[PDB]
């Protein structure tokens, strides 16, 4: 399983 | 799945 | 601001 | 699908 | 202001 | 800021 | 920045 | 097994 | 940068 | 055994 | 770039 | 035996 | 036997 | 690219 | 005799 | 693209 | 896609 | 006799 | 007589 | 899909 977590500032 | 939620001020 | 929402199901 | 909706003050 | 609407298929 | 969270099981 | 960790099973 | 560890800045 | 390492037994 | 080792920029 | 080396026994 | 050797830009 | 020869850019 | 060569003798 | 002919895009 | 050709006599 | 045609004798 | 006819996409 | 009829996905 | 049909007299 690949767990993803965080945030982005731009598209 | 990977959920996406929030906002951006630039591209 | 540009609202961003939804999901990336296929990667 | 990642839906996007709003407005930017500059590029 | 630049209106931005739509969706991303592959993020 | 856009929150990215979740999981990719199959690539 | 978005942290990604884990394992790919279905390639 | 394919192990993953790191980060993405935009996706 | 997402670091990738390991082995593919099957897909 | 197909071995893997390196780094990616996107998912 | 992800270096990939090795062999498949049963294709 | 099916031998494999080289590099991929992404998974 | 069945011979295999060429290249791939993805897995 | 990942070079692929060899043979599948047992199937 | 089983004759095989063609090409693959992925491993 | 990987070329697959040849024959399987015994399974 | 890889065409496979013919007959199995040694099962 | 065991007759075979068709195709494989990955092997 | 052992009869056979169907379809397979791999070899 | 590889279509299979026929009879096994012996193996």
């Amino acid at each position: 399983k690949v767990k993803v977590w965080g945030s982005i500032k731009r598209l």
Side-chain angles (χ1 to χ4, degrees), chain A:
Chain A
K1 171 152 68 70
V2 178
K3 291 125 289 189
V4 167
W5 189 275
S7 71
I8 55 149
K9 292 171 172 187
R10 294 231 275 195
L11 222 65

